Amino acid sequence: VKPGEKFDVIIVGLGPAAYGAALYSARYMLKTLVIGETPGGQLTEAGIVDDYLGLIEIQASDMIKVFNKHIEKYEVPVLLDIVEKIENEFVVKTKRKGEFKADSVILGIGVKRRKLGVPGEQEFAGRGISYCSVCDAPLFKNRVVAVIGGGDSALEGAEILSSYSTKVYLIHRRDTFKAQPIYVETVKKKPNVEFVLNSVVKEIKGDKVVKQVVVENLKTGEIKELNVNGVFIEIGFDPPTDFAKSNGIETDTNGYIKVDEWMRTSVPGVFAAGDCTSAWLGFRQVITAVAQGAVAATSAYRYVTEK
Amino acid sequence: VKPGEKFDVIIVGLGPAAYGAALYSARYMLKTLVIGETPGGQLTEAGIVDDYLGLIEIQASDMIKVFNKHIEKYEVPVLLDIVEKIEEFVVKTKRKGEFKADSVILGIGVKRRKLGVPGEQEFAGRGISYCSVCDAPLFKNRVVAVIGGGDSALEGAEILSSYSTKVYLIHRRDTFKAQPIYVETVKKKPNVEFVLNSVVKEIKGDKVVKQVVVENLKTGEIKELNVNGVFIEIGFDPPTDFAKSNGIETDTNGYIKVDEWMRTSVPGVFAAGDCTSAWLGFRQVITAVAQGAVAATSAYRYVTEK
């Protein structure tokens, strides 16, 4: 593909939602272009994925490879770059590869995970550290684990891990949690979840795999070394509010791109799917992102053919 | 399992939505039982599936096997039988007794309206299809017929016009009942031919479909059209009788009414897939499986908070 080329649809992103949208877009015979920064999106940080029906215990890197193969079967051009602006046909401007034209746009830009950044985090990646509790909980049956964070992701994470794991240490830097009351009350009733409030993780330690987390109480300055086999980092996600505003796309009060049932945004001709949207907000899974991508491609098809 | 045994969740049905709900329910460590009549649901009548991301050109029967393998990896017990009533909840089956549950997930789908003409059953999988969005790519440069007059028929003719050399759109009434926007859009296609006030009398061929015999109900004329494929898009029967029999609210089209989180009108009963009011008109394996995950999540939230 070359700058100035026109497409029926341009899909922004390269995570599950974008692959899902590209497969349906191409099969509708829509001239499709995918422009995304990182192939696989957040799957680049996952280990084994066993929650996508039909792909049993697949390495996340192999899921990304087969998702790409599926869209390439239909010769969908994929450009690795960042989309900086979407102007209204639509002109999509990228950072390094120029501008492209499109009759419709599908946003599958997801959300950025809020980073922790402590020593041992990168060294133990794939060896005890996980960024998804619901995804990996079955893997820590009868292991002691720690969950870091205090929003819904963290509390729901501690709730499912408490069912599987020996014990969960729920560590959060504030005095109270910010998750929904119903989640805090449910977790509070688990005898094997211990709240470690007013604390931060100083380091994650181990040999071949994770074995301990060093925690500091911000109020007393006291240090604790907890013996754990897994550390689940669940501090949250930042939605693409600035990108949306910059491009005149409405966001809900949570900062997510607002869509209706059919994945339509506030801008006619612009649809969205996956983690970046207000649909099924808080449930972030490959299966739902791929399905939303199919729906957004279907709404883009109806839009383009009718235009 | 044994009659009278209790579960956190009982899943009714064994199509893609049920398998999707089962995977997530089991992964939420919920004690789960699936009771469905036919393994695979409508997938038993599908050919090759190439629209479910990650499973490239998979035979419908093979998708049924890997979906079953996946939930059996979590040791989910599966009973093959009919659920007769949903009275905690008491789920009464036809031959395996009653079972109790804290929540229920309905993945009962809908039945395809049948045409019932000679050659139909004989040529299934040999030129006959019931899903245009699914099989259109297989008919590039071929001639096809679409039978029907609703939105699925019109959109199907539109998708097929982008692949096939010629598309006959056959419908028994003087007008189509699909959205006018669909009718006007398709009309412009140079390779689509409306064949109104007509019915198909026979679908014939040799090893595969080669012709459709059509009767014009006004002009009385009987003609044969050579086609390589026949897409039957005449709709489905909603699950209304079962819904009303079980006190479940339906939408204005007779489908099980659900909210964004797949919750039905009855607290603790959720639903997923074709049988629901969600994304009505779009009936695909990927969306059914996703709705099942959402319904399982809502059931998990319900039970853990119950």
XYZ file of C-alpha atoms in Angstrom:
613
model
C 0.000 0.000 0.000
C 1.081 3.543 -0.742
C 0.264 6.963 0.761
C -2.859 8.507 -0.867
C -4.477 5.152 -1.628
C -8.199 4.925 -0.853
C -9.880 2.074 1.001
C -13.428 1.156 1.883
C -12.303 0.755 5.467
C -9.247 1.532 7.534
C -8.890 -0.357 10.806
C -6.714 1.311 13.475
C -4.946 -1.077 15.815
C -3.532 -4.573 15.653
C -4.948 -6.379 18.653
C -7.749 -8.998 18.719
C -10.467 -6.437 17.924
C -8.628 -5.227 14.787
C -7.907 -8.768 13.555
C -11.578 -9.650 14.196
C -12.734 -6.607 12.235
C -10.255 -7.222 9.401
C -11.388 -10.803 8.899
C -15.044 -9.790 8.491
C -14.182 -6.641 6.487
C -12.150 -8.564 3.957
C -14.789 -11.339 3.707
C -17.443 -8.695 2.948
C -15.165 -7.850 -0.069
C -14.423 -4.407 1.441
C -11.018 -3.023 0.324
C -9.413 -3.032 3.757
C -6.222 -1.582 5.320
C -5.058 -2.303 8.895
C -2.668 0.283 10.494
C -1.502 -0.714 13.987
C 1.585 -0.187 16.142
C 2.133 -3.524 17.861
C 0.957 -6.825 16.337
C -1.185 -8.628 18.901
C -1.694 -5.668 21.196
C -1.846 -6.689 24.872
C -1.457 -10.324 23.761
C 2.252 -9.448 23.631
C 2.179 -9.529 27.412
C 0.170 -12.703 27.872
C 1.458 -16.214 28.453
C -0.784 -19.168 27.672
C -4.306 -18.323 26.510
C -6.951 -20.908 27.337
C -10.122 -18.819 27.341
C -10.664 -18.511 23.560
C -12.892 -21.444 22.643
C -11.332 -23.881 20.178
C -7.700 -22.740 20.614
C -6.675 -24.962 23.521
C -3.749 -23.785 25.709
C -2.191 -21.697 22.931
C 0.874 -19.539 23.572
C -0.174 -15.912 23.124
C 2.581 -15.451 20.554
C 1.147 -18.371 18.501
C -2.385 -16.877 18.805
C -1.070 -13.609 17.338
C 0.589 -15.598 14.532
C -2.545 -17.512 13.567
C -4.806 -14.420 13.835
C -2.420 -12.683 11.393
C -2.426 -15.730 9.066
C -6.211 -15.706 9.019
C -6.416 -12.104 7.827
C -3.504 -12.527 5.431
C -5.324 -15.385 3.763
C -7.548 -12.533 2.474
C -4.523 -10.416 1.482
C -5.260 -7.646 3.949
C -2.419 -5.111 3.888
C -1.071 -4.398 7.369
C 0.987 -1.291 8.059
C 2.998 -1.094 11.270
C 2.737 2.497 12.421
C 0.884 4.947 14.617
C -2.282 6.775 13.500
C -2.054 10.387 14.686
C -5.202 11.879 13.239
C -8.458 11.040 11.530
C -9.939 13.912 9.538
C -13.227 14.025 7.704
C -14.353 10.763 3.173
C -11.852 10.214 5.975
C -8.144 10.970 5.779
C -6.091 8.900 8.173
C -2.704 10.420 8.978
C 0.097 8.201 10.284
C 3.363 9.092 12.026
C 5.860 7.682 9.545
C 4.004 6.281 6.599
C 1.863 9.142 5.278
C -1.920 9.737 4.860
C -4.511 7.276 3.464
C -8.161 7.760 2.486
C -11.154 5.690 3.555
C -14.945 5.659 3.326
C -15.162 4.338 6.906
C -12.866 3.781 9.878
C -12.877 1.111 12.591
C -11.029 1.939 15.822
C -9.576 -1.085 17.685
C -7.055 0.947 19.655
C -7.595 -0.768 22.972
C -6.333 0.672 26.230
C -2.901 1.027 27.699
C -2.226 -0.965 30.816
C -1.083 1.341 33.671
C 2.482 0.286 34.392
C 4.040 -0.651 37.705
C 7.736 -0.749 36.902
C 9.557 -2.449 39.785
C 12.807 -4.429 39.761
C 12.280 -8.053 38.831
C 9.174 -7.318 36.775
C 10.856 -7.725 33.397
C 13.285 -10.399 34.569
C 10.445 -12.652 35.748
C 8.080 -11.923 32.828
C 6.662 -15.306 31.883
C 8.042 -16.775 35.120
C 5.487 -15.899 37.762
C 4.313 -12.462 36.729
C 0.878 -12.101 35.119
C -1.157 -9.127 34.053
C -4.476 -10.968 33.924
C -6.029 -12.696 36.981
C -9.068 -14.226 35.284
C -6.886 -15.456 32.487
C -4.218 -17.103 34.629
C -5.988 -18.041 37.861
C -6.426 -21.724 36.826
C -2.644 -21.881 36.530
C -2.096 -20.999 40.212
C -4.233 -23.608 41.917
C -2.918 -24.068 45.429
C -0.077 -21.497 45.039
C 0.273 -18.352 47.200
C -0.082 -15.196 45.116
C -0.154 -11.430 45.366
C -2.393 -9.073 43.395
C -1.300 -5.452 43.095
C -3.809 -2.683 42.580
C -7.046 -1.430 44.021
C -9.651 -0.955 41.280
C -12.218 -3.459 39.966
C -9.577 -5.429 38.026
C -7.614 -6.024 41.215
C -10.597 -6.920 43.438
C -12.215 -9.164 40.859
C -8.752 -10.615 40.344
C -8.385 -11.399 44.069
C -11.908 -12.885 44.105
C -11.201 -15.449 41.382
C -7.656 -16.135 42.576
C -9.017 -16.729 46.087
C -11.048 -19.616 44.628
C -8.022 -21.232 43.041
C -4.970 -20.175 45.063
C -3.854 -20.961 48.596
C -3.989 -17.322 49.602
C -4.015 -13.937 47.966
C -2.132 -10.883 49.274
C -3.979 -7.849 47.836
C -1.516 -4.938 47.907
C -2.640 -1.364 47.262
C -0.913 1.979 47.929
C -3.989 3.769 49.223
C -5.808 3.557 52.525
C -8.962 2.122 50.895
C -9.813 0.422 47.596
C -11.543 2.281 44.760
C -13.347 -0.734 43.317
C -17.115 -1.236 43.465
C -18.432 -1.863 47.015
C -19.942 -5.170 45.987
C -16.467 -6.416 45.041
C -14.787 -5.197 48.215
C -17.488 -6.764 50.356
C -17.306 -10.101 48.487
C -13.503 -10.271 48.758
C -13.646 -9.190 52.401
C -15.559 -12.382 53.126
C -12.839 -14.671 51.720
C -10.781 -16.048 54.608
C -7.747 -16.521 52.369
C -7.462 -12.933 51.064
C -5.327 -10.580 53.180
C -5.493 -6.830 52.517
C -2.113 -5.120 52.396
C -3.191 -1.489 52.175
C -1.030 1.656 52.286
C 1.759 -0.299 50.613
C 3.800 -0.469 47.447
C 5.874 -3.207 45.846
C 9.588 -2.470 46.116
C 10.823 -5.520 44.293
C 9.905 -8.907 42.895
C 12.484 -11.616 43.651
C 13.192 -15.234 42.745
C 15.572 -17.765 41.190
C 14.170 -19.316 38.009
C 10.615 -18.242 38.898
C 9.043 -15.673 41.214
C 9.425 -16.498 44.908
C 8.956 -13.297 46.876
C 7.616 -9.765 46.743
C 9.081 -7.045 48.994
C 6.425 -4.610 50.176
C 6.672 -1.273 51.997
C 3.965 0.274 54.158
C 3.909 3.942 53.141
C 2.682 5.001 56.595
C 5.051 3.125 58.902
C 7.967 2.562 56.555
C 7.899 -1.086 57.569
C 9.180 -3.697 55.124
C 7.712 -7.147 54.531
C 8.996 -9.983 52.375
C 6.083 -12.149 51.210
C 6.665 -15.645 49.840
C 4.574 -15.916 46.662
C 4.616 -17.996 43.504
C 2.758 -15.452 41.393
C 2.384 -11.701 41.159
C -0.659 -10.348 39.391
C -0.301 -6.710 38.364
C -3.787 -5.245 38.101
C -3.468 -1.558 38.598
C -5.719 -0.630 35.773
C -6.000 0.810 32.291
C -5.957 4.288 30.679
C -8.558 4.667 27.946
C -7.779 6.626 24.734
C -9.655 9.692 25.873
C -7.152 12.224 24.436
C -7.062 10.529 20.987
C -10.862 10.466 20.924
C -11.228 14.110 21.873
C -8.487 15.124 19.457
C -10.441 13.387 16.712
C -13.890 14.573 17.666
C -15.170 11.230 18.904
C -17.333 11.123 21.968
C -16.199 9.328 25.127
C -18.320 8.255 28.095
C -17.666 9.608 31.610
C -15.238 6.694 32.043
C -13.105 8.034 29.206
C -13.927 5.188 26.782
C -15.077 5.579 23.159
C -18.870 5.501 23.373
C -20.538 3.020 21.073
C -24.082 1.774 20.600
C -25.075 -1.867 20.263
C -23.807 -1.910 16.684
C -20.359 -0.466 17.557
C -21.229 2.931 16.050
C -19.397 5.956 17.545
C -20.707 9.524 17.646
C -19.173 10.144 14.185
C -21.094 8.637 11.249
C -18.729 6.307 9.416
C -16.487 5.708 12.437
C -17.041 2.455 14.410
C -15.042 0.981 17.296
C -14.487 -2.406 18.900
C -12.611 -4.034 21.736
C -11.109 -2.594 24.941
C -11.249 0.983 23.786
C -15.063 0.934 23.713
C -17.791 1.474 26.327
C -19.388 -1.943 25.539
C -18.994 -4.716 28.086
C -16.823 -2.174 29.893
C -14.476 -3.869 32.324
C -14.651 -7.295 30.680
C -11.468 -7.429 28.633
C -11.103 -10.756 26.851
C -9.959 -11.896 23.429
C -13.280 -13.558 22.545
C -15.405 -10.454 23.150
C -12.966 -8.157 21.364
C -12.912 -10.414 18.281
C -16.741 -10.574 18.274
C -17.070 -6.790 18.595
C -14.656 -6.497 15.704
C -17.005 -8.683 13.616
C -19.935 -6.423 14.558
C -18.059 -3.197 13.786
C -17.003 -4.599 10.358
C -20.668 -5.479 9.699
C -21.798 -1.952 10.594
C -18.990 -0.517 8.412
C -20.117 -2.751 5.512
C -23.743 -1.535 5.815
C -22.498 2.051 6.003
C -20.186 1.891 2.971
C -22.543 -0.050 0.742
C -25.395 2.332 1.544
C -23.165 5.410 0.966
C -23.874 -36.689 37.582
C -26.871 -37.930 39.574
C -30.490 -36.702 39.549
C -31.183 -34.082 42.197
C -27.520 -32.999 42.252
C -27.038 -29.220 42.577
C -24.874 -26.959 40.435
C -23.843 -23.309 40.541
C -24.910 -23.079 36.926
C -26.823 -25.215 34.450
C -26.357 -24.440 30.756
C -29.230 -25.362 28.445
C -28.181 -26.209 24.850
C -25.064 -27.482 23.090
C -24.402 -25.019 20.304
C -21.542 -22.459 20.127
C -23.147 -20.212 22.751
C -23.445 -23.107 25.215
C -19.821 -24.198 24.640
C -18.740 -20.585 25.143
C -20.663 -20.247 28.400
C -19.365 -23.618 29.558
C -15.718 -22.689 29.042
C -16.054 -19.495 31.058
C -18.297 -21.008 33.772
C -15.822 -23.830 34.368
C -12.891 -21.372 34.328
C -14.682 -19.270 37.007
C -14.475 -22.526 39.017
C -18.242 -22.757 38.967
C -19.741 -26.263 39.357
C -21.282 -26.560 35.893
C -23.595 -28.905 34.047
C -24.530 -28.623 30.383
C -27.802 -30.228 29.138
C -28.278 -29.998 25.398
C -30.092 -32.031 22.800
C -27.676 -31.874 19.808
C -23.870 -31.415 19.992
C -22.969 -28.382 17.873
C -26.431 -26.965 17.423
C -26.866 -25.483 13.937
C -23.176 -26.295 13.277
C -24.338 -29.777 12.317
C -25.823 -28.227 9.122
C -22.816 -26.000 8.331
C -20.012 -26.896 5.951
C -16.677 -25.141 6.325
C -16.290 -22.284 8.840
C -13.729 -19.640 7.928
C -15.188 -16.672 9.842
C -14.164 -17.682 13.391
C -10.772 -16.014 13.874
C -7.908 -18.361 14.531
C -9.604 -21.555 13.237
C -8.847 -21.378 9.500
C -11.190 -23.301 7.144
C -12.383 -25.636 9.831
C -15.081 -28.190 8.991
C -18.167 -27.513 11.048
C -18.006 -31.058 12.437
C -14.357 -30.544 13.443
C -15.228 -27.262 15.187
C -17.842 -29.149 17.139
C -15.157 -31.692 18.197
C -12.584 -29.101 19.316
C -15.205 -27.073 21.154
C -16.236 -30.243 22.941
C -12.549 -31.148 23.628
C -11.985 -27.707 25.109
C -14.793 -27.862 27.651
C -14.026 -31.516 28.442
C -10.510 -30.401 29.342
C -12.266 -28.704 32.273
C -14.224 -31.909 32.945
C -17.592 -30.304 32.321
C -20.293 -32.950 32.538
C -22.522 -32.953 29.440
C -25.969 -34.601 29.383
C -27.586 -35.169 26.003
C -31.272 -34.602 26.593
C -34.092 -32.096 26.405
C -34.815 -29.541 29.133
C -38.585 -29.435 29.639
C -39.010 -26.869 32.339
C -37.159 -24.440 34.565
C -38.898 -24.021 37.917
C -32.866 -22.036 43.604
C -33.845 -23.457 40.178
C -35.101 -26.902 39.318
C -34.277 -27.988 35.779
C -36.384 -30.892 34.619
C -35.134 -32.987 31.728
C -37.013 -35.456 29.620
C -34.996 -38.556 30.476
C -32.348 -37.758 33.102
C -34.441 -36.446 35.972
C -34.329 -33.062 37.677
C -31.232 -31.081 38.653
C -30.967 -27.979 40.800
C -28.915 -24.849 40.199
C -28.299 -21.363 41.554
C -28.324 -19.940 38.045
C -29.250 -20.961 34.530
C -27.881 -19.968 31.088
C -30.075 -20.548 28.029
C -28.152 -21.179 24.796
C -31.148 -22.735 23.011
C -30.734 -20.998 19.641
C -33.487 -20.881 17.041
C -34.741 -23.232 14.357
C -34.152 -22.329 10.733
C -37.355 -21.891 8.739
C -37.320 -24.672 6.172
C -38.152 -24.341 2.459
C -39.057 -27.993 1.950
C -38.565 -28.439 -1.768
C -37.263 -31.481 -3.667
C -33.489 -31.657 -3.972
C -32.957 -29.548 -0.868
C -31.830 -32.245 1.531
C -30.177 -34.278 -1.169
C -27.836 -31.433 -2.187
C -26.973 -30.127 1.279
C -23.240 -29.475 1.334
C -23.183 -29.859 -2.453
C -24.213 -26.384 -3.529
C -26.829 -25.469 -0.975
C -26.113 -23.027 1.804
C -28.114 -21.355 4.567
C -25.665 -18.542 5.308
C -24.573 -15.999 2.728
C -22.082 -14.090 4.866
C -20.447 -17.469 5.689
C -20.181 -19.070 2.238
C -20.220 -16.201 -0.267
C -16.399 -16.210 -0.668
C -16.700 -19.772 -1.966
C -18.724 -18.590 -4.937
C -16.392 -16.138 -6.627
C -17.134 -16.139 -10.384
C -20.034 -18.558 -10.101
C -23.795 -18.114 -10.534
C -25.998 -18.331 -7.443
C -29.592 -18.001 -6.327
C -30.727 -16.452 -3.067
C -34.190 -17.451 -1.875
C -35.962 -15.072 0.492
C -37.289 -11.580 0.946
C -36.181 -10.363 4.374
C -33.036 -8.577 5.466
C -30.894 -11.719 5.458
C -31.867 -12.428 1.852
C -31.238 -8.900 0.605
C -27.913 -8.453 2.430
C -26.944 -11.943 1.344
C -27.668 -11.030 -2.287
C -25.616 -7.862 -1.805
C -22.577 -9.719 -0.367
C -22.833 -12.379 -3.049
C -22.989 -9.732 -5.807
C -19.372 -8.876 -4.866
C -18.253 -12.475 -5.480
C -20.529 -14.187 -7.972
C -20.978 -13.538 -11.691
C -24.749 -13.394 -11.314
C -27.214 -13.510 -8.470
C -30.885 -14.424 -8.826
C -32.866 -13.157 -5.853
C -36.074 -15.269 -5.727
C -39.061 -14.348 -3.498
C -42.713 -15.474 -3.506
C -44.310 -12.075 -2.902
C -44.718 -9.046 -5.146
C -42.415 -7.049 -2.885
C -39.591 -7.725 -0.469
C -40.190 -7.296 3.287
C -36.551 -6.284 3.926
C -35.583 -2.703 4.776
C -36.181 -0.499 1.779
C -32.597 0.692 2.066
C -31.406 -2.855 1.384
C -33.722 -3.201 -1.620
C -32.656 0.048 -3.250
C -28.959 -0.697 -2.704
C -29.104 -4.182 -4.187
C -31.249 -3.067 -7.122
C -28.355 -0.982 -8.499
C -26.113 -4.021 -8.853
C -25.684 -4.904 -12.529
C -25.266 -8.622 -11.705
C -28.276 -9.097 -9.395
C -31.623 -10.190 -10.862
C -34.831 -9.879 -8.899
C -37.155 -12.843 -9.482
C -40.304 -11.811 -7.582
C -43.701 -13.547 -7.309
C -41.738 -16.790 -7.731
C -41.109 -20.012 -5.856
C -38.557 -22.730 -6.246
C -40.104 -26.044 -7.295
C -36.961 -28.115 -7.417
C -33.200 -27.921 -6.886
C -31.420 -30.349 -9.233
C -27.915 -31.307 -10.426
C -25.580 -34.319 -10.610
C -22.756 -34.523 -8.092
C -23.480 -30.862 -7.248
C -26.191 -28.247 -7.773
C -26.654 -27.225 -11.429
C -30.139 -25.732 -11.683
C -33.095 -24.331 -9.830
C -36.519 -24.849 -11.246
C -38.714 -21.839 -10.589
C -42.430 -21.212 -10.960
C -43.668 -17.643 -11.527
C -46.879 -17.404 -9.425
C -48.384 -14.585 -11.496
C -47.432 -15.473 -15.075
C -47.695 -19.227 -14.349
C -44.400 -19.719 -16.187
C -42.066 -22.561 -15.100
C -38.392 -21.999 -15.940
C -35.002 -23.498 -15.223
C -32.094 -21.375 -14.157
C -28.573 -22.718 -14.219
C -26.830 -21.940 -10.941
C -23.797 -23.281 -9.046
C -25.188 -22.488 -5.635
C -28.468 -21.878 -3.806
C -28.579 -19.714 -0.631
C -31.716 -20.213 1.451
C -32.378 -17.129 3.569
C -35.954 -17.446 4.722
C -35.476 -16.798 8.400
C -35.869 -18.539 11.686
C -38.501 -19.434 14.229
C -37.956 -17.557 17.522
C -37.784 -19.528 20.847
C -40.982 -17.869 22.082
C -42.896 -20.975 23.175
C -40.080 -22.074 25.471
C -39.687 -18.522 26.825
C -43.372 -18.151 27.614
C -43.520 -21.686 29.026
C -40.824 -20.620 31.452
C -41.907 -17.092 32.293
C -39.111 -15.404 30.341
C -39.868 -12.052 28.728
C -39.363 -11.842 24.952
C -38.684 -8.828 22.746
C -41.076 -7.605 20.052
C -39.760 -10.213 17.618
C -40.294 -13.177 19.978
C -36.637 -13.548 21.046
C -35.400 -13.871 24.603
C -35.073 -10.333 25.875
C -31.603 -9.619 27.301
C -29.765 -6.547 28.505
C -26.150 -5.758 27.631
C -24.938 -8.362 30.140
C -27.152 -11.177 28.791
C -29.524 -10.989 31.773
C -33.081 -12.084 31.063
C -36.195 -10.847 32.926
C -35.850 -13.679 35.466
C -33.179 -12.987 38.159
C -30.483 -15.660 37.870
C -31.405 -16.782 34.333
C -29.126 -15.488 31.561
C -29.077 -16.234 27.860
C -26.690 -16.245 24.932
C -26.550 -16.790 21.218
C -29.194 -16.885 18.510
C -32.051 -17.203 20.905
C -31.448 -13.730 22.396
C -32.452 -10.231 21.364
C -28.787 -9.100 21.220
C -27.401 -8.305 17.731
C -30.664 -9.637 16.311
C -30.234 -10.617 12.686
C -26.462 -11.228 12.992
C -26.105 -14.953 13.637
C -22.449 -15.997 13.746
C -20.320 -18.450 15.703
C -17.974 -15.737 16.999
C -20.720 -13.586 18.484
C -22.513 -16.596 20.015
C -19.311 -17.778 21.721
C -18.636 -14.222 23.045
C -22.213 -13.838 24.344
C -21.769 -17.158 26.124
C -18.653 -15.806 27.870
C -20.601 -12.698 28.914
C -23.582 -14.726 30.183
C -21.181 -16.990 32.133
C -19.578 -13.903 33.639
C -22.949 -12.504 34.654
C -23.880 -15.896 36.155
C -20.577 -15.972 38.052
C -21.256 -12.478 39.414
C -24.804 -13.439 40.396
C -23.850 -16.586 42.256
C -20.813 -15.148 44.059
C -22.989 -12.230 45.263
C -26.070 -14.362 45.918
